[PDB]
Amino acid sequence: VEYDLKRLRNIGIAAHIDAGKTTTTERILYYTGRIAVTTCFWKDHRINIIDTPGHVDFTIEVERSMRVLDGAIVVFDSSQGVEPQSETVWRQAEKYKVPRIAFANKMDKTGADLWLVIRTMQERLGARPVVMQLPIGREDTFSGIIDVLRMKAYTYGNDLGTDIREIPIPEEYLDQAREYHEKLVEVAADFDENIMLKYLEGEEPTEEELVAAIRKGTIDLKITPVFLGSALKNKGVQLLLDAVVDYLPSPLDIPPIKGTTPEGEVVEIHPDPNGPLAALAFKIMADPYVGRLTFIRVYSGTLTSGSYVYNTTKGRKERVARLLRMHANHREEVEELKAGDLGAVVGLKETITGDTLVGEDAPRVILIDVAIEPKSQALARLAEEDPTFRVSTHPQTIISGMGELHLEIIVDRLKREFVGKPQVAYRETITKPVDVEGKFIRQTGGRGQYGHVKIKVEPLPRGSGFEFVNAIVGGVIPKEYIPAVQKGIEEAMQSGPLIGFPVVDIKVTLYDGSYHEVDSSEMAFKIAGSMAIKEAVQKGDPVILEPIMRVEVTTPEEYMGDVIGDLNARRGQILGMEPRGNAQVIRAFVPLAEMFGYATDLRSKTQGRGSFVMFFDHYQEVPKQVQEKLIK
């Protein structure tokens, strides 16, 4: 019993709200429960159920939720096969190469038609779908379910699961089954030579050969078997499981994961238990008891309760208090989880998500600027988890960073859990080298001040930051003020001549000036300094730098034209593109500003079938035609 790395099946139920990703799990658990990562046994196997983001988009949450599991059961709404949403899920599973099966749920709701699913899938996703079971009864008749592999029926006595009888296929369907059973028999052929020869003689192949040949084909990604049923009616839930055990991948089925080692080079992280440990934190949930817990996934070696781990992604060392195992009904305190498994590690700090943990003996390996900003308690705890955003000064309340309205996630993880102007982060920098001077003669009253300096600001390559230099020879400006100067210069940078945005990519070279043996002061040289600047800037054909964007739109081949079109209107610079299995993806450059509410446009331009993504790539000027407008 206990554990065998072959008995492990780590899966997540990818789908949508409606499709039934929830009910579908609520039942599974109900069922495995008798006869953020809940685990439950089913027929000799440990099934780890890695809860999926399921909020449709918002990859980085979904990607982690992906690289972390092996299985995946894309469940569909049999009232409309491949609805737009679930496709994108697929694309996601698609992208990350996760082997997967399909569940035609709601097989009793009015529209319910298995083929509708089979038609679509083959069409929209372009998958090679195997039909695993036929249904008996139609929609709100849908009685039992057939197994075209073992050729055996199951009639469900009620919508509760307290009734269910194996029965021979009533002759009503007798042929239909005999038909698809052979199509299946066929498919296998393609994978197990041995099979075919039996196909061609009409020789019926062993149950294993099939079930096992078909499994090979799925883990290979060449196919996607299909099961059907009703979750909120108790029909099929069990079988769906059998499937999971039957054809989904255990950790060793999956290919070793690659890893960035310093010195470059990516490597093979085998699930060798007797190997040096390596794991990944993907979700953190503050628990009522025990508190902040970290769910992980062991990839190589073994982690034991009360041990030390070196989080590479953060240089900090951490001690693993105790370890836990989340069940539906009862947390499970344990002393260790081996390579391939995964669970919650209680007692940890400093460490986040997507972090890489190792063994203080083992090899240490690793597995944004926030261009958009709007207007105490809250941000401190919100800053605890989420190093993405940034509490910022700026001339008085400016959350700043990453994806549109993801900030609105921070806005609602605020005034809910605990405005406006979602605007582009612009910059200002000269383009031609200027030579200036600053001066500050005052009286302030009876105490006279004096501060006079001379600099030469230049255009720094985009990317280079700020560079402050000193040419001052033998004190013309006394060494004790120079820093003051550097301070004022550091203040002027704050609000650019043009539109008042940080100034950047500039080289300040202080080279002369003067002073009054006493009329000078610290406040004095910080002034002429934030003058010599604000001055040299507006007199240096200043510019407005905007965030050119790097985007990844995923359009099926169908609309891949008018997309490259609208996109091109976005002032974007398409630069390439590769195909993503069925559909094709396009990577370009699109000036952030020319991109808001893009989501719903893509939404409309493609029937709600396209999905993009974007990471800040860089800064570039903006033709006066844009600036002229931007200055209005």
UniProtKB/Swiss-Prot annotation:
Keyword Nucleotide-binding in annotation: yes
Name assigned to this protein: Elongation factor G
CDD domains named among the record's database cross-references: EF-G, EFG_III, EFG_mtEFG1_IV, EFG_mtEFG_C, EFG_mtEFG_II
Binding site for GTP: 15-22, 51-55, 105-108
Organism per entry: Thermus thermophilus
Localisation per UniProt entry: Cytoplasm
Pfam families for this protein: EFG_C, EFG_III, EFG_IV, GTP_EFTU, GTP_EFTU_D2
InterPro entries xrefs: EFG_II (IPR041095), EFG_III (IPR009022), EFG_III/V (IPR035647), EFG_IV (IPR047872), EFG_V (IPR035649), EFG_V-like (IPR000640), EFTu-like_2 (IPR004161), G_TR_CS (IPR031157)
Record domain tr-type G: where: 6-252
